[model samples]
Target: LLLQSPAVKFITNPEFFTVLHANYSAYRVFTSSTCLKHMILKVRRDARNFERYQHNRDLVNFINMFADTRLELPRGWEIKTDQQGKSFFVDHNSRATTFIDPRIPLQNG
Candidate 1:
């Protein structure tokens, strides 16, 4: 391979700002590992809201794989959508709201 002469920097158009921000958050959320499904859907939602309208098909496929391997929810707990459409778990008995899934153990109980 020939030696490369220049280092290049890339910036996007103003319209791309929202999508880039959404992608940033998507990557940020994925760091939690337990948050995979939520992260995928959020990126899909962000794609719909912005003019970019891209990448969701790939995300949808990822969701299929995620759900295919998903664990059952704990009794009386279900994922609910907020007014902003973000997902959180609600335990019907305790009526508690949580960002993390209830199936995930706390304190190893």
Candidate 2:
């Protein structure tokens, strides 16, 4: 498995892919397959460079990581997953959907 086609080999290539930072300001660099896999899987599936890639350990790991750092959601607010298997925010009362997670209301607390 050390050698593979361009499509398979390019999954971990940093020059071809980058992930946006948490601040929505800049992209963080990547060579690790986990990062690249997570970045590509979160977008429109049709726009992805690799079509056959399907395993989602990276996505699950990132979501689990978020679970550890996430703040509590208020009533009627929930986290939901999309058809593409990405997590998004949901507000039942307002019928709203968002990609941004809830933030802590307290300052430095």
Give the poorly placed runs of model 2, Cα more than 4 Å off: 1-68, 104-109
TM-scores across all candidates? 0.31, 0.30
Q: Write the per-residue lDDT of candidate 1 for residues 36-108, one digit (tens) a residue.
A: 4454344334433212312244332322222311667766878878799756566676665544444421112
Per-residue accuracy of model 2 over 24-75 as CA lDDT, tens digit each: 2223222245665456554324335333333344433332332323556766
TM-score of 1: 0.31
Q: For candidate 1, give the lDDT.
A: 0.37
The 10-residue segment of model 1 with minimum total lDDT is 1-10
Q: What is the lDDT of residue 35 in candidate 2?
A: 63
Candidate 2 lDDT for residue 39: 60
Give the lowest summed-lDDT range of ten residues in model 2: 1-10
Which stretches of model 1 miss by more than 4 angstroms? 1-69, 82-85, 106-108
Candidate with top TM-score is 1
Error of 1 at 36 (Å): 20
